[PDB]
């Protein structure tokens, strides 16, 4: 039963890592896109001021 307990705990951690990868792929990608667009906006405003 202890071995089964440890295996189930490791499986739970595996599912958690899968959800973390889901967050990175589906959610953080959009935030990185926002970061890139914001950097482009900053650079454009700097170019206009210059």
């Amino acid at each position: 039963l202890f071995n089964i307990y440890l295996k189930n705990i490791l499986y739970f951690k595996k599912v958690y890592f899968n959800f973390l990868d889901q967050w990175w792929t589906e959610y953080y990608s959009q935030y990185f896109d926002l970061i890139c667009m914001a950097k482009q906006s900053i650079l454009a405003q700097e170019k206009l001021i210059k």
Binding site: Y11, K14, V15, N18
Partner: protein
């Protein structure tokens, strides 16, 4: 990959381009059809090139006599792909 047309009240005020990643696109949800294995990878709760010796490799004599294998190459077929471009008309600016 996409052409965004900001329609006014049907005159295009602005036309912008959104490019693509260039990788293979799949419409099937990978995560919903992927099963996390139980009996596989159920263990294990910066240092990889350590078994390589520069001096030992340098001490090996160069290959002079080569015995050929008849069929060692197959062919080269270049991958030719066509990029599609959709057009999305919107009233709220992007």
């Amino acid at each position: 990959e996409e052409i965004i047309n900001l329609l006014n009240n049907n005159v295009s005020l602005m036309r912008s381009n959104i490019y693509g990643d260039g990788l293979k696109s799949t419409v099937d949800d990978f995560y919903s059809n992927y099963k996390i294995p139980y009996n596989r990878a159920y263990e294990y709760h910066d240092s990889s090139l350590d078994n390589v010796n520069i001096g030992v490799i340098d001490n090996i004599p160069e290959i002079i006599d080569v015995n050929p294998y008849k069929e060692n190459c197959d062919k080269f077929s270049p991958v030719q792909k066509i990029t599609s471009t959709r057009e999305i008309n919107t009233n709220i600016p992007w």
